[PDB]
Amino acid sequence: SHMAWVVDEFDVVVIGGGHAGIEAALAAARMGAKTAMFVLNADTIGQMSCNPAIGGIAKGIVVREIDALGGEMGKAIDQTGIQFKMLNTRKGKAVQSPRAQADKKRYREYMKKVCENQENLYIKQEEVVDIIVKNNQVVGVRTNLGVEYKTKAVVVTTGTFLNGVIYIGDKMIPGGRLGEPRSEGLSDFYRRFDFPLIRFKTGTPARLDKRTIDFSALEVAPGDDPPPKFSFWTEPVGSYWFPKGKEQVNCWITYTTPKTHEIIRKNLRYCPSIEDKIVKFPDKERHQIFLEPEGLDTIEIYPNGLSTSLPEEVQWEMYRSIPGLENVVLIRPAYAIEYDVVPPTELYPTLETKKIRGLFHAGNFNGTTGYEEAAGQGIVAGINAALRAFGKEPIYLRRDESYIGVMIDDLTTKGVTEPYRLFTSRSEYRLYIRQDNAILRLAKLGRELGLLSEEQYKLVKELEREIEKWKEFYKSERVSVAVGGDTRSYSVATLMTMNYTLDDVKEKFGYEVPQHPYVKEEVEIQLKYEPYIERERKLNEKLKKLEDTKIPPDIDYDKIPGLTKEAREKLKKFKPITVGQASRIDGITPAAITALLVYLGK
Amino acid sequence: SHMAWVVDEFDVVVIGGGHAGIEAALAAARMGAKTAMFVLNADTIGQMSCNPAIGGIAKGIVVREIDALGGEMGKAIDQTGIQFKMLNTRKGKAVQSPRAQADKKRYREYMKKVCENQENLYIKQEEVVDIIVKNNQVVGVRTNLGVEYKTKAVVVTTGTFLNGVIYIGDKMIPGGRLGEPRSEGLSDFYRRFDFPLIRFKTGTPARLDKRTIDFSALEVAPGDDPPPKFSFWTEPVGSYWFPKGKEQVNCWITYTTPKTHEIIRKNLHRTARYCPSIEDKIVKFPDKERHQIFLEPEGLDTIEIYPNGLSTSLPEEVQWEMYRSIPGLENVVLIRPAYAIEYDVVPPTELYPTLETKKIRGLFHAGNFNGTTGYEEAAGQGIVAGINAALRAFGKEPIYLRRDESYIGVMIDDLTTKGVTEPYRLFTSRSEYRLYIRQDNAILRLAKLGRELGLLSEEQYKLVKELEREIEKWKEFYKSERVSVAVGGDTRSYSVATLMTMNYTLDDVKEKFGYEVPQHPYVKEEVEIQLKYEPYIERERKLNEKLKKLEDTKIPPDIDYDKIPGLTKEAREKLKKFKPITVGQASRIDGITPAAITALLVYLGK
Ligand SMILES: Cc1cc2nc3c(=O)[nH]c(=O)nc-3n(C[C@H](O)[C@H](O)[C@H](O)COP(=O)(O)OP(=O)(O)OC[C@H]3O[C@@H](n4cnc5c(N)ncnc54)[C@H](O)[C@@H]3O)c2cc1C
Ligand SMILES: Cc1cc2nc3c(=O)[nH]c(=O)nc-3n(C[C@H](O)[C@H](O)[C@H](O)COP(=O)(O)OP(=O)(O)OC[C@H]3O[C@@H](n4cnc5c(N)ncnc54)[C@H](O)[C@@H]3O)c2cc1C
């Protein structure tokens, strides 16, 4: 009688309606799993609580990847962004990453609409306080209303809410976010099963009133024209560029002054709070600040670079010492949030818990910070939760093929000491894992899982085919050029390696060029970088070998000859899925890898 | 150092971004007062937490009045409403009242957008935990972040938040609303100043998934065509009707069954007037076999359905059972459970009809915190409190709305003169001038005050005056144009105006007698309504002549009731506590005897 009815039983239960939860719930539901997404306040689904932006150095590529796998974040920002630009634009297209300013309000509504109308997905406003487990297998969930719902798998994405404490000056206020409640009960479930629990703390700037800011002397920071898109599926379909002339808004730049730093001092690894970095870098005389609009209708301005947790009275003084903000009025005070986190090392690269079958974690609760890093994990967790529910085998993303894979690999293999951010990761395949080819690297898996339709993948296969045609064509079409006082014969493909664009080649030599925007650009990029991709691949050949060497899930590390005791210990807890992953465990020696390889018969 | 800077000093501080707070903050700001609107979550400004509707029996007229005074509610629902209709459409236009279904989401956004861009208005996301007083005069406000802001007046509209507790079965959860935090500290200020504090409790239904409901056999409930508008200012300007063909959505009807009722009885335990919770009205009306239920959409993008008539605070597992016993909902899935909220309330008897506190000058109260419940009742008080707060800030005298001229005035009068033992609702009030205070003439009754305060622009009022003049020209025209009619086998000479009381409409008079009619939509309809009801309005006015007499008799603010001869001791105790501003209001205090009123009239030299 405390048990919900048949009509209230699910395959997958996602705890959380944030960035991880949304991708997870949408992925599972779209794969056919009857999914329930629990949320503390149904009106906050999809809410952006920090920076009003999507994308960035590594973040932007992850979004592109989420979009390729069949997720929503990419489509959401394309439809609700108010500014788009490319970062690292002076060093070749391969190192670039897209970034956009979002209209927070429109973004939230967009995600709520897609979620509400998603077939097989049900939203439940209720606080989950416990997970029901039978023989290390997830079988249900309980809320603080004394009810229980049956489920086959659970994806936890409590974000910054679990036992959240808001910090402002010496005031401590319970909550998952400023002005919102926090969750509590679920933490007892984790202690009860002996899961390690740690607390992370991150801050956010105050929210400023646009009418009280003098922008007159500030430098304008505009978008790009034509602006890049995050989704391969939005209009223009099969392309990553918006039409030239798309309507965009501005951002403004200002800086801290020595007076700002003195105010902070009087009131006293990657610590972003202005207060922290003036102590970490006592010598920098000024710190850059980006004033960002929060939407087209709102007057709130997000001052990027001024996150703090100082008392509100001090916030007034420090914010008003910044040129342009002399008379600024705060709408929302800056603050810092501390919450519960379960160390990622408790998971396999499938995001599934080692202790309990059918339990997956994602987002800030998993030790990361950021919308994108959360959404990237969420889609994987959602995918695997559905698979589990269907009695199939969970998958994982190889770090040598996607940035989502790199992130997940570092979390579950290295663990975290502080919140993980995508820009701290080091991809050994940075030339292959680019912004322009997420679609080519992940679309197959996306279609395989059923997230992409037959039609979506058909477009991908076609373009991929067109691309290969032209590459083989330009590689067979030679041309004679006068290099100084001597004459040479080079193929068009090779000319791309010598500062020629396809447009240059057509203009000077009259050759033809792909008419499809994507094929046209992707061909140029692949030919220009072929030399480096091949060299990069050559250098990591040994990493590739290890990565392709699977380790039995039923492997008894105690029966392996030539493996130290301290090694069996680590290999016993991390439980690597491949020898390549096993070699990344901090502390394992090249010898151990050998013993293991020998034992595996290689 | 804990004190906010000069740039953070205000004339008026409104605590709350709800329905009372929005009208109060916008009114004061539009009147020129530097205004700060505090709220717990800036993203919840203008949020509708209960029924997704605006209007109804008395509520609809109050919206028309808010709009006539220069408020926003009217404009808001007109731009975000997805269904509009008139109630009591078979009993003459005088007893009709507008009602609309709102797209909750669009409505919230609309209010947030207007408030954010309103000049002189500043939004502050922060919890006010104390009000600073100097010689019984509001001087500032303090928040839970240890900071203070200077202000000259404060409007408190905590709604259902102050020490709010959510109820579901046996569970008690702190919160101002399901999924939202509650406020607490401010209650200390009131105990500290010895204010009386009571707790009211109201419930709301669950939110249902539209795709799990079978509407196949349910009665459809559409809007009207043409649909009525709430604002006189939205397009078509200077009119109360939308064009024919406006796109609207439907609502659906269902009923409870005997099985539904038996489900509630098995799960009800004993515990020590208007109790809308289905579970209460079946114990209060044991003989009713079925209860009507209106299934209404909450917006165009959302799949959430609001089951009007099924508010409850029963355990969630019991809710599943009762909701599923209702035809069409056999397999319904809840998105949000039903619950009841209990919050702090300061008895309205602590205020003058101006909504200002008798104990502290510059302090005003409005909305649920004031003892009422409903969006419209809150916004009605809000605009008044906002207006008076700004006036106070400027050193001018606060105003009040006479109950014989507006329904808002009726509400405020009843609240401050009768007090409340339960949440006050607009349909329970009784206007002795129900024929004068109509839905069609709110604009004619309140536009002058609206313009006088600065809420309406010169151009807005100019329109009202022009129409007001055309209306009068037409009435005098139809009053001098006689026609001949055959009352049986007899011939009579009647003025066109008289025919309006003999079942003739202006359209009938033109079609049959060929007379001209007004071309402006409002003039054309108001002339007809005014002529048709002139007889009753005059009779109503004659029957209340005495009431008008008493209401026009002002009572000095500093009268010493102890010095009035011929006044009982129990009568002086009521007069000293309620402190009526007119003899009319005084005669409305429960217990006051006709003799006591005479002694007072004599004392005032009458
Ligand atoms: C103060 C602050 C500072 C930040 N700083 C940074 C930064 O420096 N850099 C950066 O990139 N990003 C930052 N962020 C953004 C942050 O990473 C995201 O807000 C979010 O936490 C990430 O996505 P998520 O899915 O994990 O969680 P969230 O978006 O937070 O969502 C969690 C969801 O879980 C639900 N929930 C929690 N518990 C329960 C329960 N028991 N039952 C049901 N539902 C539950 C909540 O209702 C909520 O919808 C910051 C955010 C805040 C609030
Ligand atoms: C459970 C429930 C049952 C209901 N039942 C009915 C019904 O039967 N009939 C009907 O017509 N209507 C009903 N309603 C609707 C209700 O009348 C409105 O939701 C609202 O309370 C009325 O307007 P308001 O302005 O007074 O308050 P609200 O709209 O509730 O707003 C209050 C505002 O005050 C702010 N606040 C509170 N404390 C502080 C503080 N210390 N500092 C700063 N800000 C603060 C909050 O953030 C909030 O924005 C119900 C609502 C609920 C939640």
Residue B431: φ, ψ to 5°:
-90, 125
Element (H, E) at B498: helix B496-499
Contacts of A315 in chain B (CB under 8 A): none
Q: Which two tokens stand for residue B483?
A: 């026609």
What is the C-alpha to C-alpha distance for residues A79 and A74, in angstroms, rounded to an integer? 9
Instruction: Report yes or no: B182 and B342 within 8 Å, Cβ to Cβ.
Output: no
CB contact under 8 Å between B117 and A173, yes or no, is: no
Give the residue numbers of the binding site of B for NAD(+).
273-285
Q: Which two tokens stand for residue A7?
A: 């009509």
What is the C-alpha to C-alpha distance for residues B500 and B477, in angstroms, rounded to an integer? 13
Angle B375-393/B407-418 helices, nearest 10 degrees?
80
Q: How far apart are the first and last CA of chain B?
A: 57
The residues, ordered by sequence, that sit 6+ positions from B184 with a Cβ below 8 Å of its Cβ are B129, B162, B163
Instruction: Report yes or no: A289 and A256 within 8 Å, Cβ to Cβ.
Output: yes
Q: Is A67 annotated as a binding residue?
A: no
What is the C-alpha to C-alpha distance for residues B280 and B422, in angstroms, rounded to an integer? 15
Query: Looking up tokens 């009753």, which residue turns up?
Result: B536
Q: Which two tokens stand for residue B221?
A: 């409930």
**B506, burial (CB in 10 Å: exposed 0-12, middle 13-18, buried 19+):** buried
**A27, burial (CB in 10 Å: exposed 0-12, middle 13-18, buried 19+):** buried
The technique by which this structure was obtained is X-ray
Q: Which two tokens stand for residue A537?
A: 């691949």
Segments in A10-58 forming alpha helices (H): 19-30
What is the C-alpha to C-alpha distance for residues A347 and B528, in angstroms, rounded to an integer? 77
Single out the residue of B320, B313, B315 nearest to residue B340, CA to CA: B313
Element (H, E) at B418: helix B407-418
What is the C-alpha to C-alpha distance for residues B163 and A166, in angstroms, rounded to an integer? 20
Residue type, A242: F
What is the C-alpha to C-alpha distance for residues B336 and A426, in angstroms, rounded to an integer? 44
Q: Name where chain B breaks: residue before each gap, C-N > 2.5 Å.
A: 272
What is the C-alpha to C-alpha distance for residues A508 and A176, in angstroms, rounded to an integer? 61
Q: How far is the CA of A365 from the centre of ligand 1 (A)?
A: 8
What is the C-alpha to C-alpha distance for residues B263 and B19, in angstroms, rounded to an integer? 36
Distances (CA, A) of B500 to A70, B442, B550: 68, 22, 33
Collapsing DSSP to helix, strand or coil, A48 comes out as coil
**A139, burial (CB in 10 Å: exposed 0-12, middle 13-18, buried 19+):** middle
The residues, ordered by sequence, that sit 6+ positions from A453 with a Cβ below 8 Å of its Cβ are A447
Fold held by A453-549 = Arc Repressor Mutant, subunit A (1.10.10)
Out of B145, B170, B178, whose CB is closest to A168? B145
Q: Which two tokens stand for residue A209?
A: 């009133």
Of all residues in chain A, the one with the smallest CA distance to B206 is A125
What is the C-alpha to C-alpha distance for residues B569 and B596, in angstroms, rounded to an integer? 10
Please work out whether the CB of residue A160 comes within 6 Å of at least one atom of ligand 1: yes
Fold held by A205-334 = Elongation Factor Tu (Ef-tu); domain 3 (2.40.30)
DSSP codes, B538-575: HHHHHHTHHHHHHHT-B--TT--GGG-TT--HHHHHHH
Please state the length of chain B.
606
Strand ordering across the sheet containing B148-150: B128-133, B138-143, B148-150
Please work out whether the CB of residue A177 comes within 6 Å of at least one atom of ligand 1: yes
Single out the residue of B208, B216, B206, B205 nearest to residue B328, CA to CA: B216
Contacts of A42 in chain B (CB under 8 A): 179, 207, 335-336
Collapsing DSSP to helix, strand or coil, B375 comes out as helix
Contacts of B168 in chain A (CB under 8 A): 145
Q: Is A196 annotated as a binding residue?
A: no
What is the C-alpha to C-alpha distance for residues B235 and B69, in angstroms, rounded to an integer? 18
- Which residue CA neighbors atom 49 of ligand 2 most closely? B17
Residue B93: φ, ψ to 5°:
-50, -20
Instruction: Report yes or no: A259 and A321 within 8 Å, Cβ to Cβ.
Output: yes
Query: Looking up tokens 């695997």, which residue turns up?
Result: A384
- Mutation test residue for ligand 1: of A26, A202, A273, A337, the one with most atoms within 8 Å of CB: A202
CB contact under 8 Å between B145 and A312, yes or no, is: yes
Residue type, B294: F
Distances (CA, A) of B187 to A107, B127, B234: 37, 12, 40
The residues, ordered by sequence, that sit 6+ positions from A343 with a Cβ below 8 Å of its Cβ are A196, A198, A367, A415, A416
Collapsing DSSP to helix, strand or coil, A276 comes out as helix
Element (H, E) at B385: helix B375-393
Element (H, E) at B364: strand B363-365
Ligand 1 atom at minimum distance from A378 CA = 25
Single out the residue of B129, B127, B140 nearest to residue B38, CA to CA: B127
Instruction: Report yes or no: B127 and B40 within 8 Å, Cβ to Cβ.
Output: yes
User: Each residue of A540-550: b (16+ CB within 10 Å) or e?
Assistant: beebeebbebe
Q: Using DSSP bridges, classify how beta strands A207-209 and A198-204 pair: parallel, antiparallel or unpaired.
A: unpaired
Q: Which two tokens stand for residue A387?
A: 């698979």
Q: Which two tokens stand for residue A222?
A: 């505009």
CA distance A122 to chain B (A): 8
- Mutation test residue for ligand 2: of B178, B375, B377, B424, the one with most atoms within 8 Å of CB: B375
The Cβ of residue A1 has, within 10 Å, a number of other Cβ atoms equal to 7
Out of B1, B7, B43, whose CB is closest to A329? B7
Query: Looking up tokens 């919890």, which residue turns up?
Result: B127
Out of B47, B333, B337, whose CB is closest to A7? B333
Distances (CA, A) of A340 to A182, A335, B181: 11, 17, 20
CB contact under 8 Å between A181 and B178, yes or no, is: no
- Which residue CA neighbors atom 29 of ligand 2 most closely? B18
The residues that bridge with B467 in the sheet, in sequence order, are none
Residue type, B301: D
Distances (CA, A) of A514 to A340, A478, A518, B557: 52, 18, 9, 88
Element (H, E) at A495: helix A492-495
The CATH number for B554-606, chosen from 3.50.50.60, 1.10.150.570, 1.10.10.10, 3.20.20.70, is 1.10.150.570
Strand ordering across the sheet containing B153-156: B121-125, B35-39, B12-15, B153-156, B363-365
What is the C-alpha to C-alpha distance for residues B471 and B459, in angstroms, rounded to an integer? 19
Single out the residue of A218, A226, A279 nearest to residue A251, CA to CA: A218
What is the C-alpha to C-alpha distance for residues B204 and B341, in angstroms, rounded to an integer? 8
Out of A147, A312, A329, whose CB is closest to B317? A147
Q: Using DSSP bridges, classify how beta strands B148-150 and B153-156 pair: parallel, antiparallel or unpaired.
A: unpaired
What is the C-alpha to C-alpha distance for residues A443 and A448, in angstroms, rounded to an integer? 8
Please work out whether the CB of residue A127 comes within 6 Å of at least one atom of ligand 1: yes
DSSP codes, A455-467: HHHHHHHHHHHHH
User: Each residue of A206-240: b (16+ CB within 10 Å) or e?
Assistant: bbbbbebbeeeebeeeebbeebbbbbbbbeeebbb
Q: Is A269 annotated as a binding residue?
A: yes
Instruction: Report yes or no: B409 and B426 within 8 Å, Cβ to Cβ.
Output: no
Q: How far is CA A50 from the centre of its chain?
A: 15
Residue A584: φ, ψ to 5°:
-85, -15
Question: Which of A2, A3, A7 is most worth mutating to test chain B (most B CB atoms within 10 A of its CB)?
Answer: A7
Distances (CA, A) of A389 to A382, A394, B56: 11, 10, 49
Residue A339: φ, ψ to 5°:
-150, 175
E-assigned strands of B70-218?
81-87, 97-102, 121-125, 128-133, 138-143, 148-150, 153-156, 165-168, 171-174, 198-204, 207-209
The residues, ordered by sequence, that sit 6+ positions from B271 with a Cβ below 8 Å of its Cβ are none
User: Each residue of B284-307: b (16+ CB within 10 Å) or e?
Assistant: eeeeeeebebbbbbbbebbbbbbb
Element (H, E) at B344: strand B339-345
Q: Which residues line ligand 2 (CB under 6 A)?
A: B 15-21, 38-40, 44, 49-50, 127-128, 157-162, 176-177, 183, 186, 202-204, 276, 341, 367-369, 373-375, 378
CB contact under 8 Å between B145 and A122, yes or no, is: no
Single out the residue of A224, A218, A176, A220 nearest to residue A60, CA to CA: A224
Fold held by A550-602 = DNA polymerase; domain 1 (1.10.150)
- Mutation test residue for ligand 2: of B158, B369, B411, B426, the one with most atoms within 8 Å of CB: B158
Ligand 2 atom at minimum distance from B186 CA = 41
Distances (CA, A) of B53 to A80, B101, B301, B423: 29, 4, 16, 19
Collapsing DSSP to helix, strand or coil, A194 comes out as coil
Element (H, E) at B107: helix B104-117
What is the C-alpha to C-alpha distance for residues A339 and A162, in angstroms, rounded to an integer? 6
What is the C-alpha to C-alpha distance for residues B110 and B50, in angstroms, rounded to an integer? 18
What is the C-alpha to C-alpha distance for residues A376 and A361, in angstroms, rounded to an integer? 12
Q: Which ligand is nearest to the CA of B186?
A: 2
The residues, ordered by sequence, that sit 6+ positions from B602 with a Cβ below 8 Å of its Cβ are B566
Residue B582: φ, ψ to 5°:
-140, 160
User: Each residue of A276-293: b (16+ CB within 10 Å) or e?
Assistant: bbbeeeeeeeebebbbbb
Of all residues in chain B, the one with the smallest CA distance to A48 is B43
User: Each residue of B382-405: b (16+ CB within 10 Å) or e?
Assistant: bbbbbbbbbbbbeeeebebbbbbb
Q: How far is the CA of B160 from the centre of ligand 2 (A)?
A: 4
CA angle in degrees (0–180, nearest 5) for A53-A55-A58: 140
Single out the residue of A181, A179, A140 nearest to residue A36, CA to CA: A140
Q: How far is the CA of B379 from the centre of ligand 2 (A)?
A: 11
Single out the residue of B149, B117, B116, B152 nearest to residue B130, CA to CA: B149
DSSP codes, B57-83: TTHHHHHHHHHHHT-SHHHHHHHHEEE
What is the C-alpha to C-alpha distance for residues B369 and B344, in angstroms, rounded to an integer? 7
**B521, burial (CB in 10 Å: exposed 0-12, middle 13-18, buried 19+):** middle
Instruction: Report yes or no: A157 and A20 within 8 Å, Cβ to Cβ.
Output: yes
- Mutation test residue for ligand 2: of B40, B111, B273, B411, the one with most atoms within 8 Å of CB: B40
Please report, to the nearest 10 degrees, the dihedral formed by the alpha carbons of residues B568, B570, B574, B580 taken in order. -10
What is the C-alpha to C-alpha distance for residues B87 and B89, in angstroms, rounded to an integer? 5
Q: Which two tokens stand for residue B342?
A: 């209990």
What is the C-alpha to C-alpha distance for residues B403 and A143, in angstroms, rounded to an integer? 49
What is the C-alpha to C-alpha distance for residues A225 and A86, in angstroms, rounded to an integer? 10
Q: How far is CA A76 from the centre of its chain?
A: 14
CB contact under 8 Å between B331 and A147, yes or no, is: no
Distances (CA, A) of A602 to A549, A572, A577, A581, A592: 9, 21, 16, 16, 14
The residues, ordered by sequence, that sit 6+ positions from B539 with a Cβ below 8 Å of its Cβ are none
Segments in A31-154 forming alpha helices (H): 59-69, 73-80, 104-116
Ligand 1 atom at minimum distance from A184 CA = 41
Collapsing DSSP to helix, strand or coil, B587 comes out as coil
What is the C-alpha to C-alpha distance for residues B379 and B111, in angstroms, rounded to an integer? 12
Q: How far is CA A586 from the centre of its chain?
A: 24
Single out the residue of B324, B343, B342 nearest to residue B332, CA to CA: B324
Q: How far is the CA of B369 from the centre of ligand 2 (A)?
A: 8
Q: Which two tokens stand for residue A36?
A: 């329930």
CB contact under 8 Å between B179 and A8, yes or no, is: no
- Domain B205-338 coded CATH 3.90.226.10: no
Single out the residue of B573, B583, B531 nearest to residue B553, CA to CA: B583
DSSP codes, B253-321: EEE--HHHHHHHHHT---------STTTTTTSSTT-S--EEEEEE--SS--EEEEET----S-HHHHHH
CB contact under 8 Å between B146 and A169, yes or no, is: yes
Contacts of A113 in chain B (CB under 8 A): 301-302
Identify the CATH number of the domain defined by range B457-553.
1.10.10.1800
The Cβ of residue A489 has, within 10 Å, a number of other Cβ atoms equal to 9
Single out the residue of A129, A165, A134, A168 nearest to residue A148, CA to CA: A129
Of all residues in chain B, the one with the smallest CA distance to A143 is B316
DSSP B179: T
Domain locations in chain B as residue ranges: 1-204+339-456, 205-338, 457-553, 554-606
The Cβ of residue B454 has, within 10 Å, a number of other Cβ atoms equal to 14
Q: Which two tokens stand for residue B278?
A: 């289905």
Which of A458-463's residues contact partners 24+ apart within 8 Å by CB, and which partners?
A459/A237, A459/A238, A463/A238, A463/A516, A463/A518, A463/A519, A463/A522
**B265, burial (CB in 10 Å: exposed 0-12, middle 13-18, buried 19+):** exposed
Q: Is A277 annotated as a binding residue?
A: yes
- Which residue CA neighbors atom 27 of ligand 1 most closely? A159
Please work out whether the CB of residue A17 comes within 6 Å of at least one atom of ligand 1: yes
Please work out whether the CB of residue A183 comes within 6 Å of at least one atom of ligand 1: yes
